[PDB]
Structures are given as structure tokens and as C-alpha cells.
Scaffold this active site. Structure first.
Site, mmCIF file in Angstrom:
data_model
loop_
_atom_site.group_PDB
_atom_site.id
_atom_site.type_symbol
_atom_site.label_atom_id
_atom_site.label_comp_id
_atom_site.label_asym_id
_atom_site.label_seq_id
_atom_site.Cartn_x
_atom_site.Cartn_y
_atom_site.Cartn_z
ATOM 1 C CG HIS A 35 -8.354 -3.549 -1.410
ATOM 2 N ND1 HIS A 35 -9.332 -2.644 -1.759
ATOM 3 C CD2 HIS A 35 -7.287 -2.814 -1.017
ATOM 4 C CE1 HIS A 35 -8.878 -1.416 -1.586
ATOM 5 N NE2 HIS A 35 -7.638 -1.490 -1.135
ATOM 6 C CB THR A 77 -7.137 -16.315 1.616
ATOM 7 O OG1 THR A 77 -7.212 -15.534 0.416
ATOM 8 C CG2 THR A 77 -7.651 -17.719 1.340
ATOM 9 C CG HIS A 114 -1.389 5.514 -0.442
ATOM 10 N ND1 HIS A 114 -1.961 5.818 0.775
ATOM 11 C CD2 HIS A 114 -2.360 4.918 -1.174
ATOM 12 C CE1 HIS A 114 -3.224 5.427 0.777
ATOM 13 N NE2 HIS A 114 -3.491 4.878 -0.394
ATOM 14 N N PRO A 142 -7.370 7.923 -4.114
ATOM 15 C CG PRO A 142 -7.587 5.749 -4.927
ATOM 16 C CD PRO A 142 -6.596 6.898 -4.837
ATOM 17 C CG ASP A 163 8.163 11.114 -5.960
ATOM 18 O OD1 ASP A 163 7.436 10.435 -5.198
ATOM 19 O OD2 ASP A 163 7.934 12.310 -6.218
ATOM 20 C CG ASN A 185 -0.743 8.562 2.985
ATOM 21 O OD1 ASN A 185 -0.842 7.403 2.582
ATOM 22 N ND2 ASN A 185 -0.277 9.547 2.228
ATOM 23 C CG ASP A 206 -9.836 -12.427 0.600
ATOM 24 O OD1 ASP A 206 -10.971 -12.940 0.702
ATOM 25 O OD2 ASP A 206 -8.919 -12.938 -0.074
ATOM 26 N NE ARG A 265 -3.924 2.172 2.157
ATOM 27 C CZ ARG A 265 -4.406 2.933 3.131
ATOM 28 N NH1 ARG A 265 -3.899 2.836 4.352
ATOM 29 N NH2 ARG A 265 -5.390 3.791 2.886
ATOM 30 C CB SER A 276 7.014 12.263 -2.687
ATOM 31 O OG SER A 276 5.801 11.614 -3.037
HETATM 32 C C1 HEM Z 1 -9.028 1.526 -6.193
HETATM 33 C C2 HEM Z 1 -8.992 2.459 -5.083
HETATM 34 C C3 HEM Z 1 -8.603 2.146 -3.785
HETATM 35 C C4 HEM Z 1 -9.198 2.621 -2.660
HETATM 36 C C5 HEM Z 1 -10.369 3.600 -2.559
HETATM 37 C C6 HEM Z 1 -8.495 2.071 -1.529
HETATM 38 C C7 HEM Z 1 -8.856 2.257 -0.187
HETATM 39 C C8 HEM Z 1 -8.284 1.640 0.922
HETATM 40 C C9 HEM Z 1 -8.729 1.811 2.286
HETATM 41 C C10 HEM Z 1 -9.911 2.636 2.800
HETATM 42 C C11 HEM Z 1 -7.922 1.033 3.057
HETATM 43 C C12 HEM Z 1 -8.044 0.859 4.566
HETATM 44 C C13 HEM Z 1 -7.107 1.793 5.322
HETATM 45 C C14 HEM Z 1 -7.306 1.742 6.829
HETATM 46 O O1 HEM Z 1 -8.380 1.291 7.278
HETATM 47 O O2 HEM Z 1 -6.388 2.165 7.563
HETATM 48 C C15 HEM Z 1 -6.982 0.385 2.159
HETATM 49 C C16 HEM Z 1 -6.046 -0.573 2.539
HETATM 50 C C17 HEM Z 1 -5.213 -1.298 1.699
HETATM 51 N N1 HEM Z 1 -5.112 -1.060 0.342
HETATM 52 FE FE1 HEM Z 1 -6.281 0.118 -0.787
HETATM 53 N N2 HEM Z 1 -7.471 1.249 -1.946
HETATM 54 C C18 HEM Z 1 -7.494 1.319 -3.334
HETATM 55 C C19 HEM Z 1 -6.535 0.701 -4.145
HETATM 56 C C20 HEM Z 1 -5.454 -0.071 -3.736
HETATM 57 C C21 HEM Z 1 -4.353 -0.482 -4.590
HETATM 58 C C22 HEM Z 1 -4.198 -0.069 -6.057
HETATM 59 C C23 HEM Z 1 -3.485 -1.200 -3.801
HETATM 60 C C24 HEM Z 1 -2.265 -1.824 -4.135
HETATM 61 C C25 HEM Z 1 -1.953 -2.424 -5.405
HETATM 62 C C26 HEM Z 1 -4.066 -1.188 -2.471
HETATM 63 C C27 HEM Z 1 -3.603 -1.920 -1.384
HETATM 64 C C28 HEM Z 1 -4.113 -1.900 -0.091
HETATM 65 C C29 HEM Z 1 -3.684 -2.763 0.971
HETATM 66 C C30 HEM Z 1 -2.715 -3.926 0.808
HETATM 67 C C31 HEM Z 1 -4.336 -2.375 2.094
HETATM 68 C C32 HEM Z 1 -4.095 -2.907 3.502
HETATM 69 C C33 HEM Z 1 -2.960 -2.144 4.155
HETATM 70 C C34 HEM Z 1 -2.717 -2.556 5.596
HETATM 71 O O3 HEM Z 1 -3.407 -3.476 6.085
HETATM 72 O O4 HEM Z 1 -1.832 -1.954 6.242
HETATM 73 N N3 HEM Z 1 -5.220 -0.429 -2.421
HETATM 74 N N4 HEM Z 1 -7.224 0.754 0.851
HETATM 75 CA CA LIG Z 2 5.218 9.897 -4.716
HETATM 76 CA CA LIG Z 3 -6.641 -13.281 -0.168
#
Ligand code: HEM
Ligand SMILES: [Ca+2]
Ligand SMILES: [Ca+2]
EC number: 1.11.1.7
Length: 306
Positions: free
Chosen positions: A170, A225, A42, A139, A50, A70, A222, A38, A52
Site C-alpha cells: 500500500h 509518495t 489476490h 481480507p 495458480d 475483486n 500513500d 494486487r 485462478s
Molecule cells: C493486509 C490486508 C489487506 C487489505 C485489507 C487490503 C485492502 C485493499 C483495499 C480496500 C484496496 C482498495 C481497492 C479499491 O478501492 O478498489 C486495496 C488496494 C491495493 N492493495 Fe491491498 N489490502 C491488503 C493487503 C495487500 C497486499 C498483501 C498487497 C500486495 C503485496 C496489496 C496491494 C494493494 C495495491 C497495490 C493496491 C492498489 C491497487 C490499484 O490501485 O489498482 N494489498 N487493498
Molecule cells: Ca489463486
Molecule cells: Ca510510496
């Protein structure tokens, strides 16, 4: 142009050092692989990959760590510091923080059971952080499908496959109750739950996130898993079990004519998903990188070299 062999001469063991660091951290924090992937996401969505996002506050510019996407969410920064120090010891002033974070993201995915590949390298580190840009470009879970598509296109990812495949991130990781409360009790001021959320799963989520409860409580993205990088994320969407709004919209939005077939294809074949994920990951990793002599090879990922 970025190339996978960038450090094959200057630091051939960089990927191994990165992997070793993550393997060790996973023993005490099983969520770190997800967190690192993640961070890379970001990083790339704000002025490109970069590093940043790794910069801390200065009196001249604010840290992206305080962005709405963040703050009290992004994590794993000390782990990045640890691997950076180790790589600096093995290969002084060679590997940029931007590249380090990219390799860390790929290794994290692989360690969690995902595909294995060599990421393009040669990125350099930013000379500033972009808080306002982070607030505008990252996003949010409440985005509609058109808004999600807009966000990806804004940074350079025009393809629906980019959006659907990368959302597969996710397939593991955690999410705070705060981000789904509307779906559970009052969606779009309707006073009712989001109709695209499976009613059996709705009950389970309401139990984990009661009204007026701890909004910071964590739930798995998920349900099949929770910590394994696989295509189960898409099988969930097909059953209306995507956790956040932006997940489920890929399959249920009125504007999902182009994303539905992608969701189905990824749910039907792990190979199709993994191939698409690697392709999309490399495209995201290619967003406006600083290369050649642009930027620097930051020694401390938290501060610009002086
Ligand atoms: C399509 C738009 C996306 C939205 C709106 C979004 C939104 C979010 C939100 C709300 C969380 C929870 C943060 C929290 O509760 O602290 C999250 C976690 C996460 N997102 Fe996304 N996400 C998006 C795309 C992606 C992409 C492109 C990736 C990576 C290829 C990604 C990987 C992750 C991962 C792995 C987590 C878990 C991080 C952790 O448990 O520390 N997300 N995301
Ligand atoms: Ca950057
Ligand atoms: Ca999984």
C-alpha cells in the site's frame, strides 16, 4: 520445488517481455504497476498462486472477479492478456499464467522503484476458479488486527513479518472512498471518526470523501509518495496516517505488540523493508502451487485449455 531459473532455457527473455509490456502501459496508466501487484496478491490468497483469479465465468463455476474483494476493484486483466500473448509468441506453450503474473508483480514493484530480485518459478495453472473461497479468504479493510492475522495464517503465512511487510504494498496505488467512510464519520457505530486517524489528515480525507459523496472516488494509499514503491507507507503509520483501518491497525491495535516493532524497523530503514518485502513476497508466491504435471500451461489466461 519452485526455482528462479525455471525458464532460463525454455524462455530466457520472459522477464524482459513482461517488463517491456508494463513500461509501455505505465505511460498511459500510471496505476498499472500497483494494480498488477494486487492481482498477484489476490491470486495467491485463493487456492494459491495458480492464476485462478484470471479465469472468466463458465456455466459450471463462477469467476473470482465477482468476489467482494475483486468486483469493481481488481483491474489490469487486459494488460496481462497482452503480455501473455507476447510471451506465447516468443515461447509457445511454455510460461504459465500463474508464473507470468508472479513475474509481472515483481517487475511492477521494481519499475516503481522497489527492490529487484528473481522470483521462484515453475507454477502451473488451475483448472477452475474459486469464487466462494475468494469471498472467504481475501481480507477486508475493516478487519481488526486479529482478523488480519487470521486471514494470513489461513492461507499459510504465519509470520507477523509476512503481514507487516506485504501490507507495504500500500506504498502506492488507489483506494475508493467507500472503504474509509466509516473511519471518517461513524466508526464502529460510535458516531465519531476513528480515533487512530490523525485529525489533520482526517480533514483532508473528509474533503476528498464528503458524506453522501461519490463513494467510488479514488484516494492515494500513500500521501507521501503515491506512485513510488518505498517505505514511506510505514512512516505514515507512525504518524497515524495509514489510509484504511487495516493499515493503521498494524501500529495502533491493542494486539499490535508484535507488529509495532516491525512497522518501526521498516520505517527506519529502506533496506530492512525491501529485504523483508522480498522475503515475504517469495513466501506468498510459494502458497500451494501446482507443479510438475499438475494443472496446465494455460494458453489464454481467461479460459482453461480444452
Ligand atoms: C493486509 C490486508 C489487506 C487489505 C485489507 C487490503 C485492502 C485493499 C483495499 C480496500 C484496496 C482498495 C481497492 C479499491 O478501492 O478498489 C486495496 C488496494 C491495493 N492493495 Fe491491498 N489490502 C491488503 C493487503 C495487500 C497486499 C498483501 C498487497 C500486495 C503485496 C496489496 C496491494 C494493494 C495495491 C497495490 C493496491 C492498489 C491497487 C490499484 O490501485 O489498482 N494489498 N487493498
Ligand atoms: Ca489463486
Ligand atoms: Ca510510496
Amino acid at each position: 520445488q519452485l526455482t528462479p531459473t525455471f525458464y532460463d532455457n525454455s524462455c530466457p527473455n520472459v522477464s524482459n517481455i513482461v517488463r517491456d509490456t508494463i513500461v509501455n502501459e505505465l505511460r498511459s496508466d500510471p496505476r498499472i504497476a500497483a494494480s498488477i501487484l494486487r492481482l498477484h496478491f489476490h491470486d495467491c490468497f485463493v487456492n494459491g498462486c495458480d492464476a485462478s483469479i484470471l479465469l472468466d465465468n463458465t456455466t459450471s463455476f463462477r469467476t473470482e472477479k465477482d468476489a467482494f474483494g475483486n468486483a469493481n476493484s481488481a483491474r489490469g486483466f487486459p494488460v496481462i492478456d497482452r503480455m501473455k500473448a507476447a510471451v506465447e509468441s516468443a515461447c509457445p506453450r511454455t510460461v504459465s499464467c500463474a508464473d507470468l503474473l508472479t513475474i509481472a508483480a515483481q517487475q511492477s514493484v521494481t519499475l516503481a522503484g522497489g527492490p529487484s530480485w528473481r522470483v521462484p518459478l515453475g507454477r502451473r495453472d488451475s483448472l477452475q476458479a474459486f469464487l466462494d473461497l475468494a469471498n472467504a479468504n481475501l481480507p477486508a479493510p475493516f478487519f481488526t488486527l486479529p482478523q488480519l492475522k487470521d486471514s494470513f495464517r489461513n492461507v499459510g503465512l504465519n509470520r507477523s513479518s509476512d503481514l507487516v511487510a506485504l501490507s507495504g504494498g500500500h506504498t502506492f496505488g488507489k483506494n475508493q472512498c467507500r472503504f474509509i467512510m466509516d473511519r471518517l464519520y461513524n466508526f464502529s457505530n460510535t458516531g465519531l471518526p476513528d480515533p487512530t486517524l490523525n485529525t489533520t489528515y482526517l480533514q483532508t480525507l473528509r474533503g476528498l470523501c464528503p458524506l453522501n459523496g461519490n463513494l467510488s472516488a479514488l484516494v492515494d494509499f500513500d500521501l507521501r509518495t503515491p506512485t513510488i514503491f518505498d517505505n514511506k507507507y510505514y512512516v505514515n503509520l507512525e504518524e497515524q496516517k495509514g489510509l484504511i483501518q487495516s493499515d493503521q491497525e498494524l501500529f495502533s491495535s491493542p494486539n499490535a505488540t508484535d507488529t509495532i516493532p516491525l512497522v518501526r524497523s521498516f520505517a527506519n530503514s529502506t533496506q530492512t523493508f525491501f529485504n523483508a518485502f522480498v522475503e515475504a513476497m517469495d513466501r506468498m508466491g510459494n502458497i500451494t502451487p501446482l507443479t510438475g504435471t499438475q494443472g496446465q500451461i494455460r494458453l489464454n489466461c481467461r479460459v482453461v485449455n480444452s
